[PDB]
Symmetry: C2
Subunit: 357 residues, 2 copies
């Protein structure tokens, strides 16, 4: 069933508030993030963890990249993130006390699954899967499984699997943080409340649907797009580009906003759409400065901006949609939504398939 | 200011690469051998290596990572300087901060080094080309490339010499940590020395590549493919083509077409791929097959020892002897540099800085 939506992909984008909130709920006990909701081996395994090794592919790899910022900053555990089809065949070294974390919607992704199998002959303390399908090879073969509650996906692009993977990784960050005393019980509580507030913010984000539909006409004759973000939002930009590419077949590519200097300024002219995410954080002034460079070349700026910075965002002839995105934990998820909607509508404009067979 | 008889500074710089490579090795040899007298204190304390850089130097770092983990067996991470600079990061115990930069003045990289002094690194090392640069001055050890001066728009000899310095570093650290036998150090040392002739063999393709570049005249996209070591080499290729021809060139790890990158392939789409003589040939060949079935125009730079297994109707194949893990990454970069130069000339774009 599409539940009245025009396409399954659009239904799934609209299930995200429920999905996000179901994922959080499953790890709570009395509204607090609880270690008791995890498998009971989990704690011993986390006490031994000194390094976290995230392996995944595609959208799940983009989630992992986002999570590394959170893990290092809040849990203070070093984190590396690697593409499964590369680590699988590479002759790598495993830090002592390394936890192997895989991320997968289906739990059957070949390269990820085979990276897990290889890891069992290496120096890891153990494995954890962030997965959506219980009773999948990845869940069975890992020591512990944190389950997302995304339900099933028929959209060509994954939507709710990505946001729920982000939320699971945020919850994991706080569990680790607490166990290793990286955060006070009061910080844990403040960031837990921020995760709970995601549902309302995601729903707000979904309000931009109609305006994003109107904007998407701009893309009908376009064969390139550039996505921009910094920090946590770089991987969010990469995920946005992946959706656009995957279902509209536009050559969409993401760049960390600080790196335009060398490569991508060259590509920007007056026919080039630039989609950027401009959050309420420490790096606003850098980002506005990077955006200026791009504006200077005639790029068509399409900006999704947190309401708290919109007054500071002024570019002649840009398009600016504003929203409340919250802080470090919520904003990466919230800003994803517009990008999913963008890719949905541009796909319709191009007449490409949004749903799978 | 001399073009040395070449038509452009960039062409000249491409052709200085044999000299620059060999000069970079020389400055780190002692009687043709990797010795430490040519600091040993830090490397002893180093348990993890953190490479920080941007653009081309970052792509050199990404290649070196494969080497360092495989041969030196030291865990290594590479990060883009403008991100690590502002990120709340955690430093593993025993981490060596390694920066890479031609000028030694790159703001993001320089500030990352300054930030690192307040963190838990055992010390720093530069891989730099300008002695008396902030990065040289402020690092504990410097490993000098001998790239001379660049005036081309795209960096050519900065990149190859950075790779060679990083290979040398790998072997130094490997010896000191006893990760390889003296006989393996000797053999890989010979491999680096052999680069000069292999790079000269590659420069002979200049004319053929000129004929090929004809294909790119009306193209606005290109995809670059590589696996393992050769993925960052593909990224470097893409960076050059984009930077000087303004084509929308993008590199992908050949294992990850199985997402969107396959959707972008049609029959008017050049696919530039590096095909080395390594264990991954079978999977690279499968990857190329799928790209081929969707109408991609394959353009393949291929090691001679595997050219017999490369058979695609309507593809363009240039073969060369590229050697093994240390030399081939540097050898395969040469044709991609040459490609971007010629394509730029075909697009009427500029190859040289004013």
């Amino acid at each position: 069933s599409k539940d009245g939506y025009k396409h399954y992909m659009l239904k799934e984008i609209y299930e995200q508030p429920e999905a996000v909130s179901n994922t959080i709920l499953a790890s709570l006990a009395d509204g607090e993030i609880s270690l008791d909701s995890f498998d009971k081996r989990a704690k011993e395994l986390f006490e031994k963890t000194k390094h976290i090794c995230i392996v995944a592919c595609g959208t799940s790899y983009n989630a992992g990249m986002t999570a590394k910022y959170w893990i290092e900053k809040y849990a203070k555990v070093p984190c590396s993130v690697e593409i499964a089809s590369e680590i699988r065949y590479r002759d790598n070294v495993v830090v002592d006390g390394s936890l192997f974390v895989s991320i997968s919607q289906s739990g059957e992704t070949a390269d990820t699954l085979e990276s897990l199998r290889k890891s069992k002959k290496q120096n890891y303390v153990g494995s954890m899967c962030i997965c959506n399908v219980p009773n999948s090879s990845l869940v069975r073969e890992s020591d512990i499984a944190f389950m997302t509650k995304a339900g099933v996906e028929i959209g060509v692009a994954s939507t709710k699997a990505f946001t729920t993977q982000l939320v699971a990784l945020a919850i994991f960050t706080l569990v680790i943080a607490k166990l290793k005393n990286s955060l006070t019980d009061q910080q844990i509580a403040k960031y837990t409340e921020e995760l709970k507030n995601i549902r309302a913010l995601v729903m707000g984000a979904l309000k931009l649907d109609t305006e994003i539909d109107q904007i998407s006409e701009y893309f009908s004759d376009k064969e390139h797009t550039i996505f921009l973000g910094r920090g946590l939002y770089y991987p969010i930009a990469i995920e946005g580009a992946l959706k656009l590419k995957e279902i509209s077949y536009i050559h969409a590519e993401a760049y960390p906003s600080g790196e335009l200097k060398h490569g991508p300024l060259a590509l920007v002219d007056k026919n080039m759409p630039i989609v950027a995410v401009v959050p309420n954080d420490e790096l606003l002034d850098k980002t506005l400065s990077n955006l200026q460079e791009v504006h200077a070349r005639g790029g068509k700026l399409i900006l999704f901006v947190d309401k708290a910075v919109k007054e500071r965002v002024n570019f002649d002839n840009s398009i600016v949609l504003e929203l409340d995105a919250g802080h470090d934990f919520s904003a990466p998820v919230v800003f994803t939504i517009p990008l999913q909607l963008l890719s949905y509508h541009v796909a319709i404009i191009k007449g490409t398939d949004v749903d799978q067979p």
